């Protein structure tokens, strides 16, 4: 089994991530891996990447 979330928790509603977040990780890793890279404070030191 594989399950997005713990029994307590609610999934994120955050406008720039997809609603499919656990599926998208599971089956399009590179696409969200790159988009999630872009949302961090890590990108402060890669200027000219939107």
């Amino acid at each position: 089994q594989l399950a997005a979330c713990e029994a307590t928790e609610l999934l994120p509603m955050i406008p720039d991530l997809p609603a499919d977040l656990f599926t998208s990780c599971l089956t399009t890793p590179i696409k969200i891996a790159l988009r999630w890279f872009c949302m961090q404070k890590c990108v402060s030191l890669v200027p000219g990447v939107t």
Binding site: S44, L45, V46, P47
Partner: protein, 94 residues
């Protein structure tokens, strides 16, 4: 950051712009005057950052040059002029 630049140059040469902006923007602020050592150690770093970069850091030299020469005259931003003159020398060298 000074040490990390000088010692591991291969790491820094891609992240030159970000580091250098963050450093320049220390020198431009009005309220890091309560500690002299921030301004000193920022300038010391720019010296070493200059050393590593070389021509890569050409376009930023005019910006720094104004800043540094403005510090040299009127020591209210009282860096040890030893450090400012050293950096100036380093920019022009590199």
């Amino acid at each position: 950051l000074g040490h990390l630049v000088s010692n591991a140059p291969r790491l820094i040469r891609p992240y030159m712009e970000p580091i250098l902006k963050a450093l320049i923007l220390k020198l431009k602020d009005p309220d890091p005057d309560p500690n002299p050592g921030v301004i000193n150690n920022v300038l010391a770093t720019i010296g070493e950052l200059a050393q590593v970069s070389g021509l890569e850091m050409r376009k930023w030299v005019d910006e720094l040059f104004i800043i540094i020469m403005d510090m040299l005259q009127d020591s209210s931003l009282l860096a040890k002029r030893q450090v400012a003159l050293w950096t100036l020398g380093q920019l022009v060298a590199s």
